[PDB]
Coordinates of C-alpha atoms and ligand atoms in Angstrom, one line a residue:
Chain A
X1 CA 95.6 128.8 66.9
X2 CA 93.1 130.3 69.8
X3 CA 89.5 130.8 69.0
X4 CA 87.6 133.4 71.0
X5 CA 83.9 132.3 71.9
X6 CA 82.0 135.0 73.9
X7 CA 79.3 134.2 76.4
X8 CA 76.8 136.5 75.7
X9 CA 76.4 138.4 72.4
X10 CA 77.1 142.2 72.2
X11 CA 73.3 142.5 70.9
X12 CA 72.3 141.6 74.8
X13 CA 71.4 137.8 73.5
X14 CA 71.8 134.9 75.7
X15 CA 74.2 132.9 73.0
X16 CA 77.7 131.8 72.7
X17 CA 79.3 134.0 69.7
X18 CA 79.9 131.9 67.8
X19 CA 77.7 129.1 68.5
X20 CA 79.5 126.9 66.1
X21 CA 83.2 126.4 65.9
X22 CA 85.8 124.4 63.9
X23 CA 88.9 123.2 65.9
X24 CA 92.1 121.6 64.6
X25 CA 94.1 119.4 66.7
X26 CA 96.3 121.9 68.6
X27 CA 94.1 124.9 68.7
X28 CA 92.6 126.4 71.9
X29 CA 89.1 127.8 72.3
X30 CA 88.8 130.6 74.7
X31 CA 85.4 131.4 76.3
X32 CA 85.3 134.9 77.5
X33 CA 82.4 136.1 79.9
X34 CA 80.8 139.1 78.1
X35 CA 77.2 140.0 78.7
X36 CA 74.3 139.1 81.1
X37 CA 75.9 136.7 83.8
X38 CA 76.6 134.1 85.1
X39 CA 77.5 131.6 82.7
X40 CA 79.2 128.2 82.8
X41 CA 80.1 125.6 80.3
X42 CA 78.8 122.0 80.7
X43 CA 79.1 118.9 78.6
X44 CA 77.1 116.2 79.1
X45 CA 78.6 112.6 79.0
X46 CA 76.9 111.5 75.9
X47 CA 77.5 114.9 73.7
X48 CA 81.2 114.0 73.6
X49 CA 82.9 111.8 71.2
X50 CA 82.8 108.0 72.4
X51 CA 80.4 109.3 75.0
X52 CA 83.1 109.6 77.9
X53 CA 81.8 110.9 81.2
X54 CA 85.6 111.1 82.1
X55 CA 86.2 113.7 79.4
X56 CA 82.9 115.3 79.5
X57 CA 83.8 116.0 83.5
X58 CA 87.4 117.2 82.6
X59 CA 86.1 119.9 80.1
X60 CA 83.1 120.8 82.1
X61 CA 83.5 124.2 83.7
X62 CA 80.7 123.5 86.4
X63 CA 81.4 126.8 88.6
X64 CA 79.6 130.3 87.8
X65 CA 81.6 132.8 86.3
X66 CA 80.2 136.5 87.2
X67 CA 82.8 139.1 86.3
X68 CA 83.2 140.2 82.9
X69 CA 86.7 139.2 81.4
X70 CA 86.9 135.8 82.9
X71 CA 88.0 133.4 80.9
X72 CA 88.5 129.4 80.2
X73 CA 90.7 127.9 78.0
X74 CA 90.8 124.1 76.6
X75 CA 93.6 123.4 74.0
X76 CA 92.4 120.1 72.0
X77 CA 95.7 118.5 72.1
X78 CA 96.5 115.0 70.3
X79 CA 94.7 113.8 73.2
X80 CA 91.3 114.9 72.5
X81 CA 89.5 112.6 70.2
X82 CA 87.9 113.8 67.1
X83 CA 84.2 114.7 66.7
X84 CA 81.6 117.1 67.7
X85 CA 81.3 118.4 71.6
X86 CA 77.9 120.0 72.4
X87 CA 78.1 122.0 75.4
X88 CA 75.4 124.2 77.3
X89 CA 74.9 127.0 79.9
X90 CA 73.1 125.7 83.1
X91 CA 71.2 128.9 84.1
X92 CA 70.3 130.1 80.6
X93 CA 69.7 126.5 79.2
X94 CA 65.8 127.6 78.6
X95 CA 67.0 130.5 76.7
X96 CA 68.9 127.8 74.3
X97 CA 72.3 128.9 75.4
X98 CA 73.8 125.9 73.4
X99 CA 77.2 125.6 71.7
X100 CA 78.8 123.1 69.5
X101 CA 82.7 122.5 69.0
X102 CA 83.8 120.2 65.7
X103 CA 87.6 119.1 66.1
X104 CA 88.4 117.9 62.6
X105 CA 91.0 114.9 62.5
Chain B
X1 CA 81.6 90.5 72.8
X2 CA 84.4 88.6 74.4
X3 CA 87.2 88.1 72.4
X4 CA 89.6 85.4 73.3
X5 CA 93.4 85.8 72.6
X6 CA 95.5 83.0 73.0
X7 CA 99.2 83.7 74.0
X8 CA 101.2 81.4 72.3
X9 CA 99.3 79.6 69.0
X10 CA 98.7 75.8 69.5
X11 CA 101.1 75.5 66.8
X12 CA 103.8 76.3 69.1
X13 CA 104.6 79.6 67.8
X14 CA 105.4 82.6 69.8
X15 CA 102.5 84.6 68.6
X16 CA 99.1 86.0 69.9
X17 CA 96.3 84.1 68.4
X18 CA 94.5 86.3 67.0
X19 CA 97.2 89.0 66.3
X20 CA 94.7 91.5 65.4
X21 CA 91.5 92.0 66.7
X22 CA 88.3 94.5 66.0
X23 CA 86.5 95.5 69.4
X24 CA 83.4 97.4 69.8
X25 CA 82.7 99.7 72.9
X26 CA 81.6 97.7 75.8
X27 CA 83.8 94.5 74.5
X28 CA 86.0 92.6 76.6
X29 CA 89.2 91.0 75.1
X30 CA 90.6 87.9 77.3
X31 CA 94.2 86.9 77.1
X32 CA 94.8 83.1 77.8
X33 CA 98.1 81.7 78.8
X34 CA 98.4 78.9 76.1
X35 CA 102.0 77.6 74.9
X36 CA 105.6 78.3 75.7
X37 CA 105.3 80.4 78.8
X38 CA 106.1 83.2 80.1
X39 CA 104.0 85.9 78.4
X40 CA 102.9 89.6 79.4
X41 CA 101.1 92.3 77.8
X42 CA 102.8 95.5 77.4
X43 CA 101.2 98.9 75.6
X44 CA 103.6 101.6 75.0
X45 CA 102.6 105.2 75.8
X46 CA 102.8 105.8 72.1
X47 CA 101.1 103.1 71.0
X48 CA 97.7 103.9 72.3
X49 CA 95.2 106.8 71.1
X50 CA 96.3 110.1 72.1
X51 CA 99.8 108.6 73.2
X52 CA 98.4 108.7 76.8
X53 CA 100.8 106.8 79.0
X54 CA 98.5 106.9 81.8
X55 CA 96.2 104.6 79.7
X56 CA 99.1 102.5 78.6
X57 CA 100.2 101.9 82.1
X58 CA 96.7 100.8 83.1
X59 CA 96.2 98.4 80.1
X60 CA 99.7 96.9 80.5
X61 CA 99.8 93.4 82.2
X62 CA 103.7 94.0 83.0
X63 CA 104.0 90.6 85.4
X64 CA 104.7 87.4 83.8
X65 CA 102.3 84.8 83.6
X66 CA 103.5 81.0 83.7
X67 CA 100.6 78.6 84.4
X68 CA 98.3 77.8 81.5
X69 CA 94.8 79.1 81.8
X70 CA 95.9 82.3 83.5
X71 CA 93.9 84.9 82.0
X72 CA 93.9 88.6 81.8
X73 CA 90.6 90.7 80.8
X74 CA 90.1 94.3 79.6
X75 CA 86.3 95.5 79.0
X76 CA 86.9 98.6 76.4
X77 CA 84.4 100.6 78.2
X78 CA 83.2 104.4 77.2
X79 CA 86.3 105.7 78.8
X80 CA 88.6 104.2 76.7
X81 CA 89.3 106.2 73.2
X82 CA 88.6 104.7 69.8
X83 CA 91.6 103.6 67.4
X84 CA 94.3 101.2 67.3
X85 CA 96.2 99.6 70.4
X86 CA 99.4 98.0 69.8
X87 CA 100.8 95.6 72.4
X88 CA 103.7 93.0 72.7
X89 CA 105.3 90.4 74.9
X90 CA 108.6 91.6 76.5
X91 CA 110.5 88.2 76.7
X92 CA 109.3 87.3 73.1
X93 CA 109.9 90.8 71.6
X94 CA 112.7 89.4 69.4
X95 CA 110.5 86.8 68.0
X96 CA 107.9 89.0 66.7
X97 CA 105.1 88.2 69.6
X98 CA 103.3 91.5 68.5
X99 CA 99.3 92.4 68.6
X100 CA 96.7 95.0 67.8
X101 CA 93.5 96.0 69.2
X102 CA 91.1 98.2 67.1
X103 CA 88.5 99.6 69.1
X104 CA 85.7 101.3 66.5
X105 CA 83.8 104.0 67.4
Chain C
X1 CA 111.8 125.7 77.4
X2 CA 112.5 122.3 76.3
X3 CA 115.6 120.4 77.5
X4 CA 117.2 117.6 75.7
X5 CA 119.0 114.5 77.5
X6 CA 120.6 111.9 75.4
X7 CA 120.3 108.3 76.4
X8 CA 123.9 107.4 75.7
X9 CA 126.7 109.6 74.9
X10 CA 128.3 110.3 71.5
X11 CA 131.5 109.1 72.6
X12 CA 129.7 105.6 73.2
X13 CA 129.5 106.1 76.9
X14 CA 126.7 104.6 79.0
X15 CA 125.5 107.8 80.5
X16 CA 122.9 110.6 80.1
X17 CA 123.9 113.8 78.5
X18 CA 123.7 116.0 80.6
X19 CA 123.6 113.8 83.8
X20 CA 122.5 116.8 85.7
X21 CA 119.8 119.4 84.7
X22 CA 118.1 122.1 86.5
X23 CA 114.5 122.8 85.0
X24 CA 112.2 125.8 86.0
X25 CA 108.4 125.4 86.4
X26 CA 106.8 124.6 82.9
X27 CA 110.2 124.0 81.2
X28 CA 110.0 120.4 79.6
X29 CA 112.7 117.5 79.8
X30 CA 113.0 115.4 76.5
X31 CA 115.0 112.0 76.5
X32 CA 116.2 111.0 73.0
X33 CA 117.5 107.5 72.5
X34 CA 120.9 107.7 71.1
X35 CA 123.4 105.3 71.8
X36 CA 123.9 101.5 72.9
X37 CA 120.1 100.7 73.3
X38 CA 118.2 99.8 75.1
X39 CA 117.2 102.1 78.0
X40 CA 114.7 103.4 80.2
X41 CA 113.9 105.9 82.8
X42 CA 113.0 104.7 86.2
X43 CA 112.3 107.0 89.3
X44 CA 112.6 105.5 92.7
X45 CA 109.8 106.3 95.3
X46 CA 112.0 107.8 97.6
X47 CA 114.1 109.6 94.9
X48 CA 111.5 112.2 94.4
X49 CA 110.1 115.2 96.3
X50 CA 108.2 114.3 99.3
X51 CA 109.1 110.6 98.5
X52 CA 105.7 110.1 96.7
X53 CA 105.4 106.7 95.0
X54 CA 102.2 108.0 93.0
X55 CA 104.4 110.5 91.7
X56 CA 107.6 108.3 90.9
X57 CA 105.2 105.6 88.9
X58 CA 103.7 108.6 86.6
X59 CA 107.0 109.7 85.8
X60 CA 109.0 106.3 85.4
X61 CA 109.1 105.3 81.6
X62 CA 109.6 101.1 82.8
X63 CA 109.3 99.8 79.2
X64 CA 112.7 99.5 77.2
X65 CA 113.5 101.9 74.3
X66 CA 115.3 100.1 71.5
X67 CA 115.3 102.2 68.3
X68 CA 117.2 105.8 67.8
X69 CA 115.1 108.8 68.0
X70 CA 112.4 107.4 70.4
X71 CA 111.6 110.0 72.9
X72 CA 110.0 110.7 76.0
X73 CA 108.9 114.1 77.6
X74 CA 108.0 115.3 80.9
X75 CA 106.6 118.6 81.1
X76 CA 107.0 119.9 84.9
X77 CA 104.0 121.8 85.4
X78 CA 102.6 123.6 88.4
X79 CA 101.2 120.1 89.8
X80 CA 104.9 118.8 90.1
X81 CA 106.8 119.7 93.3
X82 CA 110.1 121.4 93.5
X83 CA 113.4 119.6 94.3
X84 CA 115.4 117.0 93.1
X85 CA 114.5 114.1 91.0
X86 CA 117.0 111.2 90.6
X87 CA 116.6 108.4 87.7
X88 CA 118.3 105.7 86.4
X89 CA 118.6 103.0 83.6
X90 CA 117.8 99.6 84.8
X91 CA 119.9 97.5 82.3
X92 CA 122.6 100.0 82.6
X93 CA 122.4 100.6 86.3
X94 CA 125.7 98.8 87.3
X95 CA 127.6 101.1 84.5
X96 CA 126.3 104.0 86.8
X97 CA 123.9 105.5 84.3
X98 CA 122.1 107.6 86.5
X99 CA 120.6 111.1 86.3
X100 CA 119.2 114.0 88.2
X101 CA 116.7 116.8 87.4
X102 CA 116.6 119.7 89.6
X103 CA 113.1 121.8 89.5
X104 CA 113.7 125.3 90.9
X105 CA 110.8 126.9 92.5
Chain D
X1 CA 99.0 119.3 112.3
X2 CA 95.2 119.7 111.8
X3 CA 93.3 122.9 111.5
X4 CA 89.7 123.2 112.1
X5 CA 87.8 125.6 110.0
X6 CA 84.1 126.0 110.9
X7 CA 81.6 126.7 108.3
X8 CA 79.2 129.4 109.6
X9 CA 80.7 131.4 112.7
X10 CA 79.2 130.8 116.3
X11 CA 77.8 134.4 116.3
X12 CA 75.7 133.2 113.4
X13 CA 77.5 135.0 110.6
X14 CA 77.7 133.4 107.0
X15 CA 81.6 132.7 107.1
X16 CA 84.4 130.6 107.5
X17 CA 86.2 130.7 111.1
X18 CA 89.0 131.2 110.5
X19 CA 88.8 132.8 107.1
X20 CA 92.3 132.9 106.3
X21 CA 94.9 129.7 107.5
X22 CA 98.4 129.1 106.9
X23 CA 99.2 125.4 106.3
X24 CA 102.4 123.6 106.1
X25 CA 103.2 120.6 103.9
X26 CA 101.7 117.7 105.5
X27 CA 99.3 119.7 107.5
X28 CA 95.6 118.9 107.4
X29 CA 92.6 121.3 107.0
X30 CA 89.4 120.1 108.5
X31 CA 85.9 121.8 107.7
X32 CA 83.2 121.3 110.3
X33 CA 79.6 122.0 109.1
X34 CA 78.5 124.3 112.2
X35 CA 75.7 127.0 111.7
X36 CA 73.2 128.0 109.1
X37 CA 73.5 125.1 106.3
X38 CA 74.0 124.3 103.7
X39 CA 77.5 124.9 102.7
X40 CA 80.1 123.5 100.4
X41 CA 83.6 124.3 99.5
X42 CA 84.4 125.3 95.9
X43 CA 87.9 126.2 94.5
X44 CA 88.1 127.8 91.2
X45 CA 90.8 126.7 88.3
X46 CA 92.2 130.0 88.8
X47 CA 92.3 130.4 92.5
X48 CA 94.7 127.8 92.8
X49 CA 98.6 127.4 92.3
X50 CA 99.3 127.3 88.6
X51 CA 95.9 127.6 87.9
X52 CA 95.6 123.9 87.7
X53 CA 91.8 123.0 86.7
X54 CA 92.4 119.4 87.4
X55 CA 93.7 120.4 91.4
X56 CA 90.9 122.8 91.7
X57 CA 88.3 120.0 90.7
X58 CA 90.1 117.3 93.4
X59 CA 89.9 120.0 96.1
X60 CA 86.3 121.2 95.4
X61 CA 83.3 119.7 97.5
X62 CA 80.8 120.7 95.2
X63 CA 78.1 118.7 97.1
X64 CA 76.1 120.4 99.7
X65 CA 76.3 119.4 103.5
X66 CA 73.3 119.9 105.7
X67 CA 73.9 118.1 109.0
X68 CA 76.0 119.8 111.8
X69 CA 79.5 118.0 112.4
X70 CA 79.6 116.8 108.9
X71 CA 83.5 117.2 107.8
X72 CA 85.5 117.4 105.1
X73 CA 89.5 116.9 104.8
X74 CA 92.4 117.7 102.7
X75 CA 95.8 116.8 103.4
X76 CA 97.9 119.3 102.1
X77 CA 101.1 116.4 101.2
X78 CA 104.1 117.1 99.0
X79 CA 101.8 116.6 95.7
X80 CA 100.0 119.9 96.4
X81 CA 101.8 123.2 95.4
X82 CA 102.7 126.0 97.5
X83 CA 101.0 129.2 97.4
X84 CA 97.3 130.4 98.3
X85 CA 94.1 128.8 97.6
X86 CA 91.0 130.8 97.4
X87 CA 87.6 129.1 98.1
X88 CA 84.1 129.9 98.5
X89 CA 80.3 128.7 99.3
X90 CA 78.3 128.9 96.6
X91 CA 75.1 128.9 98.2
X92 CA 76.2 131.9 100.7
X93 CA 78.6 133.9 97.8
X94 CA 76.4 137.0 97.8
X95 CA 77.3 137.2 101.6
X96 CA 80.9 137.3 100.8
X97 CA 81.3 133.6 102.5
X98 CA 84.8 133.2 101.0
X99 CA 88.0 131.7 102.5
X100 CA 91.6 131.5 102.1
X101 CA 94.4 128.9 102.5
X102 CA 98.3 129.7 102.1
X103 CA 100.4 126.7 101.7
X104 CA 104.1 127.5 102.6
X105 CA 106.8 125.6 101.2
Chain E
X1 CA 73.6 91.9 84.4
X2 CA 72.0 95.3 83.6
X3 CA 69.6 96.4 86.4
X4 CA 67.4 99.0 85.1
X5 CA 66.2 101.8 87.8
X6 CA 63.7 104.2 86.9
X7 CA 64.2 107.8 88.1
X8 CA 60.5 108.6 89.3
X9 CA 58.2 105.9 89.8
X10 CA 55.1 105.0 87.7
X11 CA 52.8 106.0 90.2
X12 CA 54.3 109.4 90.3
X13 CA 56.6 109.4 93.4
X14 CA 59.7 110.9 93.6
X15 CA 61.7 107.9 93.9
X16 CA 64.3 105.6 92.6
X17 CA 62.5 102.0 91.4
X18 CA 63.9 100.1 92.9
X19 CA 65.5 101.7 95.8
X20 CA 67.9 99.1 96.8
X21 CA 69.9 96.9 93.9
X22 CA 72.4 94.1 94.7
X23 CA 74.7 93.9 91.9
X24 CA 77.9 91.5 91.4
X25 CA 81.0 92.6 89.6
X26 CA 80.9 93.0 85.8
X27 CA 77.1 94.0 86.1
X28 CA 75.8 97.4 84.9
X29 CA 73.2 99.6 86.7
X30 CA 71.1 101.8 84.3
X31 CA 69.1 104.7 85.2
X32 CA 66.3 105.8 82.9
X33 CA 64.5 109.4 83.4
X34 CA 60.6 108.2 83.8
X35 CA 58.4 110.6 85.7
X36 CA 58.6 114.0 87.2
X37 CA 61.9 115.3 85.8
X38 CA 64.5 116.8 86.5
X39 CA 66.6 114.3 88.3
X40 CA 70.3 113.8 88.9
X41 CA 72.5 110.8 90.5
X42 CA 75.0 111.8 93.3
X43 CA 77.3 109.9 95.8
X44 CA 79.0 111.7 98.5
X45 CA 82.5 111.2 99.3
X46 CA 81.6 109.3 102.3
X47 CA 78.7 107.0 101.1
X48 CA 80.8 105.0 98.7
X49 CA 83.2 102.2 100.1
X50 CA 86.6 103.4 101.5
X51 CA 85.1 107.1 101.6
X52 CA 87.0 107.8 98.2
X53 CA 86.2 111.1 96.8
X54 CA 87.8 110.3 93.5
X55 CA 85.4 107.4 93.4
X56 CA 82.4 109.4 94.2
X57 CA 83.3 112.0 91.8
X58 CA 83.5 109.5 88.8
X59 CA 80.1 107.9 89.5
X60 CA 78.0 111.3 90.1
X61 CA 75.9 112.4 87.5
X62 CA 75.7 116.2 88.6
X63 CA 73.9 117.3 85.4
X64 CA 70.4 117.5 85.5
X65 CA 68.6 115.2 83.1
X66 CA 65.0 116.3 81.7
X67 CA 63.6 114.3 78.6
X68 CA 62.4 111.0 79.4
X69 CA 64.4 108.3 78.1
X70 CA 67.9 109.8 78.7
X71 CA 69.8 106.8 80.7
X72 CA 73.2 106.9 82.6
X73 CA 75.2 103.6 82.8
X74 CA 77.6 102.3 85.4
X75 CA 79.3 98.8 85.1
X76 CA 81.0 97.7 88.2
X77 CA 84.0 96.4 87.0
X78 CA 87.1 94.9 89.0
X79 CA 88.2 98.6 89.7
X80 CA 85.4 99.2 92.2
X81 CA 85.3 98.5 95.3
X82 CA 82.6 96.0 97.3
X83 CA 80.1 97.3 99.5
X84 CA 76.9 99.8 99.7
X85 CA 76.8 102.7 97.3
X86 CA 74.4 105.5 98.6
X87 CA 73.2 108.1 96.2
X88 CA 70.8 110.5 95.8
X89 CA 68.5 113.5 93.5
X90 CA 69.4 116.9 94.6
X91 CA 66.4 118.5 93.2
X92 CA 64.3 116.0 95.0
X93 CA 66.3 115.4 98.2
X94 CA 63.6 116.6 100.8
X95 CA 61.5 114.2 99.2
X96 CA 63.7 111.6 100.2
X97 CA 64.6 110.2 96.7
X98 CA 67.4 108.4 97.8
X99 CA 69.0 105.2 96.8
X100 CA 71.1 102.4 97.6
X101 CA 73.6 100.0 95.6
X102 CA 75.4 97.1 97.1
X103 CA 78.2 95.3 95.3
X104 CA 79.0 91.8 96.5
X105 CA 82.4 90.3 96.4
Chain F
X1 CA 100.9 99.7 114.5
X2 CA 103.9 98.9 112.1
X3 CA 104.9 95.3 111.4
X4 CA 108.3 95.0 109.9
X5 CA 109.0 92.1 107.2
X6 CA 112.3 91.5 106.5
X7 CA 113.4 90.7 102.9
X8 CA 115.8 87.8 103.1
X9 CA 116.0 85.8 106.7
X10 CA 118.8 85.8 109.0
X11 CA 119.4 82.2 108.2
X12 CA 120.2 83.2 104.7
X13 CA 117.1 81.8 103.1
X14 CA 115.3 83.7 100.3
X15 CA 111.9 84.1 102.4
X16 CA 110.0 87.1 104.1
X17 CA 110.3 87.2 107.8
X18 CA 107.3 86.8 108.5
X19 CA 105.8 85.2 105.3
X20 CA 102.4 85.6 107.0
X21 CA 101.1 88.6 108.6
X22 CA 97.7 89.9 109.8
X23 CA 97.0 93.5 109.6
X24 CA 93.9 95.9 111.1
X25 CA 92.7 98.9 109.2
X26 CA 95.0 101.7 109.7
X27 CA 98.5 99.4 110.4
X28 CA 101.7 99.8 108.6
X29 CA 103.7 97.1 107.0
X30 CA 107.2 98.0 106.6
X31 CA 109.3 95.8 104.2
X32 CA 113.5 96.1 104.9
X33 CA 116.0 95.0 102.5
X34 CA 117.8 92.3 104.6
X35 CA 119.9 89.3 103.2
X36 CA 120.8 88.3 99.4
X37 CA 119.6 91.4 97.5
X38 CA 117.9 92.2 94.9
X39 CA 114.4 91.9 96.0
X40 CA 111.0 93.5 95.3
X41 CA 107.1 93.2 96.1
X42 CA 104.9 92.2 93.6
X43 CA 101.0 92.1 93.8
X44 CA 98.9 90.3 91.0
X45 CA 95.8 91.7 89.8
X46 CA 94.0 88.5 91.1
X47 CA 95.9 88.1 94.4
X48 CA 94.3 91.4 96.0
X49 CA 90.6 91.9 97.4
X50 CA 88.2 92.0 94.3
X51 CA 90.9 91.4 91.8
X52 CA 91.7 95.2 91.2
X53 CA 94.4 95.8 88.9
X54 CA 94.6 99.6 89.7
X55 CA 95.1 98.2 93.5
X56 CA 97.4 95.8 92.6
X57 CA 99.7 98.1 90.5
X58 CA 99.5 100.6 93.6
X59 CA 100.7 98.5 96.2
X60 CA 103.6 96.9 93.7
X61 CA 107.0 98.0 94.2
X62 CA 108.4 96.5 91.0
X63 CA 111.8 98.5 91.3
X64 CA 114.5 96.3 92.4
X65 CA 116.1 97.4 96.0
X66 CA 119.8 96.5 96.3
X67 CA 121.3 98.2 99.3
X68 CA 120.4 97.1 102.9
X69 CA 118.1 99.2 105.2
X70 CA 116.0 100.3 101.9
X71 CA 112.3 100.3 103.0
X72 CA 109.0 100.1 101.6
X73 CA 105.8 100.8 103.7
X74 CA 102.3 100.5 103.1
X75 CA 99.6 101.9 105.4
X76 CA 96.4 99.8 105.1
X77 CA 93.8 102.7 105.7
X78 CA 90.4 102.6 105.3
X79 CA 90.6 102.9 101.5
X80 CA 92.0 99.4 101.0
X81 CA 89.5 96.4 101.0
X82 CA 89.7 93.7 103.6
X83 CA 91.0 90.2 102.3
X84 CA 94.4 88.4 101.7
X85 CA 96.8 90.0 99.7
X86 CA 99.4 87.6 98.5
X87 CA 102.9 89.0 96.6
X88 CA 105.9 87.8 95.5
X89 CA 109.7 88.4 94.7
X90 CA 110.3 88.3 91.0
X91 CA 114.0 87.5 90.9
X92 CA 113.7 84.8 93.8
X93 CA 110.2 83.3 92.4
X94 CA 111.5 79.9 91.7
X95 CA 113.0 79.7 95.3
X96 CA 109.4 80.3 96.5
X97 CA 109.8 83.9 97.9
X98 CA 106.3 84.4 98.5
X99 CA 104.3 86.2 101.0
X100 CA 100.7 87.1 102.3
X101 CA 99.1 90.0 104.0
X102 CA 95.5 89.5 105.6
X103 CA 93.5 92.8 106.4
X104 CA 90.9 92.0 108.8
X105 CA 87.7 94.1 108.7
Ligands
CU201 CU1 74.7 131.8 80.3
CU202 CU1 105.4 85.6 75.2
CU203 CU1 120.8 102.4 79.3
CU204 CU1 77.6 128.6 103.0
CU205 CU1 64.3 113.8 91.4
CU206 CU1 114.1 88.3 96.6
ZN207 ZN1 74.3 112.6 81.1
ZN208 ZN1 107.4 104.9 75.3
ZN209 ZN1 111.6 102.3 96.5
ZN210 ZN1 87.1 129.4 86.5
ZN211 ZN1 81.0 114.9 101.8
ZN212 ZN1 97.5 88.9 86.3

């Protein structure tokens, strides 16, 4: 499957819609730049299963996205461990623009 | 913290002593060439967490060890996924010289 | 697409069926252990585009496969160069168990 | 061959000189910190051949360069795909400090 | 064996305490967020042994740490080359918040 | 520079000619298949500077070379550490077909 997460709610709020998402092995999470750019997706080394920095760096879209429609996908294949993945938006961190992905396995 | 696994039991049996070992992140597994050489440690691409061939190749000590005392260590850091790691000895595969490492996390 | 290559012909010959395969970027090549095991897939450093040893080592399934059904897949994504990839089976090299994959791009 | 690209024109403009460069496999691209620092080289996941994020991250010199003369080289060997590579300078993005490398092959 | 480096001296100075540390293979360096956040650890491609960008990127904790107590560890295993590793804090670079790790071997 | 090492002496001896070679940073070592094949170049994890298994695996030409003229080159760039690199030929190990490369720096 493919779960779409909008960066910036329609209401004009600095949030990820949905904030919490539960994914199964093989599913894809698609982030779409919606409202109030820029945004980026950052995963901290200790916010991913096993505290793997190597894993966090691969998932983290450090670069800022400005134009609406720009997307970033992550297919959680058999390779990725099971557990919760917490991420955030650096420019809107103070606004509490935080997200969470739970991979069940 | 450092678990020692002997390649070839004192009994003269073609086995890994211990055959099964449970490790925690940060711990090291030390293989020591004991009896009836040669021996090597091979991890198949599908016998490691996530079926990562890249991971299996890094852990696999393909080359044969002949002299007693020769060791090979693997510190299971945060970069290594949790799960069971099955390995074997190529020259003594038919004798059932197989091992298993379970990393909890 | 996914091209299946059988390691050991149905006729009981030590060959790869098919021996020559033409793949497009994105397409996958699946090797299935069929007849007269063991078999392995080895790519020499000079038998791959650009003579990249780093590339040859990643594609090479050095370890021997014994049980029928065991598979090994390689998805030739964008990261893989265009050109011919020649591989062979080490235990059946003298029998001329050689293969060839041509990636068009 | 080695193509030199100056980060910041002699005329004092926030540009890459040259902005567009055509490279052949094997040729190198050298960025030299010239005028009005800082500068960095960023490649977006979708601005490289095949939209490979793994490839973009390896080429991207995220860290800021301040002192004149500081260089960053990239030898486009066989491992690198053919196509256009668009990059930019984060601190001078609004000024349109964008570049483009076309690898023929 | 585990050397602790405080990001921000108790004195309220924007420094790494200690600034210079000598480590042996197998030892771990632990950075603890102490005073005047944020802080991050950045290693430049040319400030590590062999000028390996791949190595620098793995060690660099690009993301900003705000809460006191947050830590980042690096166990200098056999895969890491011997030599000096110079790092810095991006937000406090002008204050001269620079560090240095010397791995003996 | 480029130092040529012949795998199998003209005298018909199972040796590397020369057995010992001193190389400077940037020099290339070229192994040429000469007499009494097969041969391969294997570096053990503990026979290279720093006991880096990752380094040993990259230098090791595991696969057997049969036809005369087949070569294998290794350019010891700034990346490679200084020290002695001991290697051997697996099929002719008992004959004492061992070599040694000393990189001065
Ligand atoms: Cu945001
Ligand atoms: Cu054995
Ligand atoms: Cu075969
Ligand atoms: Cu700039
Ligand atoms: Cu700081
Ligand atoms: Cu030999
Ligand atoms: Zn962190
Ligand atoms: Zn396999
Ligand atoms: Zn070769
Ligand atoms: Zn992107
Ligand atoms: Zn740099
Ligand atoms: Zn060894």
